[PDB]
């Protein structure tokens, strides 16, 4: 427990007399073991193995192409006045939205100022709902492109 | 619970027939693989413990050992079993031409009203110039692959009032099946000593029907207990059977005033540590471990130090009447 001794011990005494042979045989068998796993593995494990193999193949293809390139050379909020028993839980209220600029490669998390025009209802605009397509204003107009009710986030693109 | 022991129904009969027998070494000398007997109460034994590793090494330990009455067993016939795809099959059987009154009664349910014509016809034909018995013996020697010997207990030599013997088959483990029947022929009408089938320190497994309990149905079921060591083997005529090398007191193992619910031991008996399925007066059959279970506990010998033989009824402060007389002394009724 002093230093890299295990490497030093290996150097001063050597690895197993068949360690290299075992590694070579394992590498040779890997060609068939991969196929066996792709054909034997079932359930979620098969899905994971297939996804990993596809990702590895895509990465290898991309690397080959790169080498070839070089080879040439939910709502928003005694304030209520006239609303009936349509109480909206505070959990559905979010003050900040994700705003991205189409012309700039930078995004800023900023508070939501006011809802301009919520589609699918004028009542939605009055109540400040955040359905997809709603036009809003942000403290620097932007429109929400995602569905906050299904993901809990409010993504908007500056108009 | 234990689903393996189900169904917990009544046993087929009091005599629990042995379902399996130990291995059959066809080269060893002919010998019996089981023996009959009757449970006779229980007693406490204190002995030294020669067992290395145990904390109690070189120490005395109190233990309980059961006592089974085993009068000499007499052979009356043999059974030849052939091998068939549907299991072993009995092709024929033979008898000794002479049967004790016990087995003759065993073949009748109302003996006193019976004419007692148990084997008169067979015996009459047996006394011919052979050709009837030798034929069966040769047939068994030719086809039979395993041979079992039929024996019965000497109930008339037992202090029980049953007066009826129980037939039982015993497998022969030794020499070839021809040697088996050859040895059996020399033993027809003869008796086999209890000490010939077992010896001291040998492990045995008992098989018998446990005490019944009626509706709860409970009890009265066949059970098997294995790994029971034999502590001592005695004889009815061997006076001072309860006298250990240390105690050396001329007293029989029979408790003062006799056993509880049982008579007195005046025949050969087997002493084994622990209890046995069944109760007193129940017929018990003894097997030997069903296999080579010679562990250190089995291997180690048990040198007995003292044997308890006091009055089992109630309590007891003395082992023999002499001790009681000496301690209590003379009394009014004495003189």
């Amino acid at each position: 427990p002093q230093n890299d001794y295990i490497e030093r011990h290996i150097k001063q005494h050597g690895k197993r007399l068949d360690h290299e042979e075992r590694k070579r045989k394992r590498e040779a068998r890997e060609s068939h073991k991969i196929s066996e796993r792709a054909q034997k593995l079932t359930g979620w494990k098969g899905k994971q193995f297939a996804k990993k193999r596809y990702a590895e193949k895509v990465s290898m293809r991309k690397k080959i192409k790169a080498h070839e390139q070089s080879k040439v050379k939910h709502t928003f909020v005694r304030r209520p006045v006239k609303m009936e028993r349509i109480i909206r839980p505070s959990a559905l209220r979010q003050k900040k939205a994700n705003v991205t600029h189409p012309e700039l490669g930078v995004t800023v998390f900023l508070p939501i100022l006011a809802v301009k025009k919520n589609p699918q209802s004028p009542m939605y605009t009055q109540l400040g709902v955040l359905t997809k397509g709603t036009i809003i204003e942000v403290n620097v107009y932007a429109q929400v492109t995602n569905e906050p009710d299904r993901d809990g986030c409010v993504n908007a693109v500056l108009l | 619970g234990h689903l393996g022991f189900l169904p917990r129904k009544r046993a087929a009969s009091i005599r629990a027939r042995v379902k399996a027998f130990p291995k059959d070494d066809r080269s060893k000398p002919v010998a019996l693989t089981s023996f009959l007997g009757y449970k006779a109460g229980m007693t406490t034994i204190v002995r030294d413990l020669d067992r290395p590793g145990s904390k109690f090494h070189k120490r005395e330990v109190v233990e309980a050992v059961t006592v089974v009455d085993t009068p000499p067993v007499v052979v009356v016939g043999v059974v030849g079993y052939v091998e068939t795809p549907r299991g072993l099959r009995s092709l024929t059987t033979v008898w000794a031409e002479h049967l004790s009154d016990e087995v003759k009664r065993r073949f009748y349910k109302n003996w006193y009203k019976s004419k007692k014509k148990a084997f008169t016809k067979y015996s009459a034909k047996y006394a011919q110039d052979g050709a009837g018995i030798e034929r069966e013996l040769a047939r068994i020697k030719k086809y039979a692959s395993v041979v079992r010997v039929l024996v019965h207990t000497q109930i008339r030599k037992t202090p029980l009032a049953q007066k009826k013997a129980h037939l039982a088959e015993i497998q022969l483990n030794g020499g070839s099946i021809s040697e088996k029947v050859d040895w059996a022929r020399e033993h027809f009408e003869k008796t086999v000593a209890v000490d010939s089938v077992f010896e001291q320190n040998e492990m045995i497994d008992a098989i018998a029907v446990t005490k019944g309990h009626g509706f709860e149905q409970r009890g009265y079921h066949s059970r098997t207990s294995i790994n029971h060591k034999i502590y001592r083997v005695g004889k009815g005529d061997d006076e001072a059977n309860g006298a250990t090398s240390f105690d050396r007191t001329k007293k029989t193992i029979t408790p003062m005033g006799g056993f509880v619910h049982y008579g007195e031991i005046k025949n050969d008996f087997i002493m084994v540590k622990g209890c046995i399925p069944g109760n007193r007066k129940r017929i018990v059959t003894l097997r030997k471990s069903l296999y080579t279970n010679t562990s250190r506990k089995a291997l180690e010998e048990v040198s007995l130090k003292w044997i308890d033989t006091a009055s089992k009824f109630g309590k007891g402060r003395f082992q023999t009447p002499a001790e009681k007389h000496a301690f209590m002394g003379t009394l009014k009724k004495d003189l």
């Binding site: 230093n3 890299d4 839980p89 959990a91 809990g152 | 067992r51 290395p52 003292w306 002499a322």
Partner: protein
């Protein structure tokens, strides 16, 4: 702990940690539900799964944080040793990254659980759960570099020496390539060859030895001539309470002239002046007078190729560190020879007899043939000790024949008088 942090749990990379957490969530918790199930039941099931995932992530992060020692909150010697090998600010930033990831995971789990209970449909609940899992994966994914760094430093810290600055100790200093480790080999169990190239030892070596029954150990250093390997030696020299031995080569080995070595020793003198220094020399010797200008430094002219003076140096270093009715004996015992373990002809002990007989669990020691007796013929004692319910031990006694004769005489004197009739 404080000596060697070999107990730190392995820091699974972002992909491995995320895979483990997701597998634990999928396996332990149930995963079977139907749209026809009670809405509250589905909400509770999804919330429980999300909470289990968050708890697993929090537990992993907390274990990683607790196992790893806070460099700033560790002994100054160990703190500086870690700083030299791993940049202290970088390590602190890496730990803060894990802390921030844990805080973000907790906040995400709480926010989603608060929002999840309001799901009006199974699809909405499933989408919220998937969004929470994606947030957790993204938080874990960003930690790939800090997680890899943590795993590397964990796998490297385990093999570090268990140095004990508080204990009295001696430090082997001097120029590199001067066989400074040869002295270590011949004074302790350590094993490092001469290796005529200078920087063989990329890390400190420690070896234990005992003098006057007092515990001691020696620490080897690569040497000084501004690099990590050289830098770590400075803090070891300064913080450690050990005495420091300066090694010098009085030969062409290492190429450095005696003047250069003396000048370097003088230049580094202000750092170890209070360490009770000693100098070992592994017109040429005239310059040693200048070295001796320091009262506390001796000049051990020697050569580390053998044990010419290592034996004396071992005691000298320890001494410098410390400076900072009549009985009855049977003649048989005196005459009996000692049991030589290596001699095959030595007297066979009970161990040999037991081995020749069998294992310890099968051989039983026999007390017979050992105890003395008047006649060895009956050594196999079978003492009954019981007779007709009477204890023989209460009657065993010599010269009982006279008592029996007296009893017989009394019986005769009572019978002739007609006592019994």
């Amino acid at each position: 702990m404080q000596l060697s942090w070999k107990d730190i749990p392995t820091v699974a990379p972002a992909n491995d940690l995320l895979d483990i957490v997701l597998n634990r969530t999928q396996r332990k918790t149930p995963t079977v539900i139907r749209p026809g199930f009670k809405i509250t039941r589905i909400r509770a099931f999804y919330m429980r799964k999300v909470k289990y995932t968050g708890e697993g992530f929090v537990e992993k992060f907390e274990d990683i944080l607790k196992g790893f020692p806070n460099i700033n909150d560790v002994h100054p010697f160990h703190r500086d040793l870690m700083d030299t090998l791993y940049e202290k600010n970088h390590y602190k930033i890496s730990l803060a990254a894990i802390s921030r990831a844990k805080s973000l995971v907790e906040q995400v789990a709480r926010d989603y659980v608060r929002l999840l209970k309001f799901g009006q449909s199974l699809f909405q609940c499933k989408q919220l759960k998937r969004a929470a899992l994606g947030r957790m994966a993204t938080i874990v994914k960003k930690l790939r570099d800090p997680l890899a760094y943590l795993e590397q430093v964990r796998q490297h810290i385990g093999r570090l020496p268990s140095i004990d600055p508080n204990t009295r100790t001696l430090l082997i200093c001097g120029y590199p390539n001067v066989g400074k480790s040869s002295f270590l080999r011949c004074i302790t169990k350590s094993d490092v060859d001469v290796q005529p190239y200078a920087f063989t030892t990329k890390s400190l070596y420690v070896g234990h030895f005992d003098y006057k029954y007092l515990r001691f150990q020696a620490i080897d250093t690569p040497g000084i001539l501004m690099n990590n390997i050289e830098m770590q030696s400075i803090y070891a020299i300064a913080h450690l309470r050990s005495c420091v031995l300066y090694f010098m080569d009085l030969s062409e080995q290492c190429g450095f002239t005696i003047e250069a070595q003396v000048k370097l020793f003088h230049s580094i003198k202000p750092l170890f002046a209070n360490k009770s220094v000693m100098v070992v020399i592994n017109e040429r010797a005239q310059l040693l007078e200048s070295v001796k200008e320091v009262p506390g430094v001796e000049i051990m002219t020697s050569s580390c190729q053998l044990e010419e003076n290592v034996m004396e140096v071992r005691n000298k270093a320890c001494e410098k560190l410390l400076a900072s009715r009549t009985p009855f004996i049977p003649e048989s015992v005196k005459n009996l020879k000692k049991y030589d373990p290596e001699d095959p002809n030595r007297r066979k002990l009970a161990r040999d007899i037991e081995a020749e007989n069998g294992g310890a669990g099968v051989f039983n020691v026999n007390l017979k043939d050992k105890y003395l007796l008047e006649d060895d013929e009956w050594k196999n004692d079978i003492m009954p000790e019981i007779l007709d319910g009477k204890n023989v031990y209460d009657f065993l006694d010599p010269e009982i024949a006279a008592k029996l004769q007296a009893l017989e005489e009394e019986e005769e004197k009572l019978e002739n008088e007609g006592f019994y009739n």
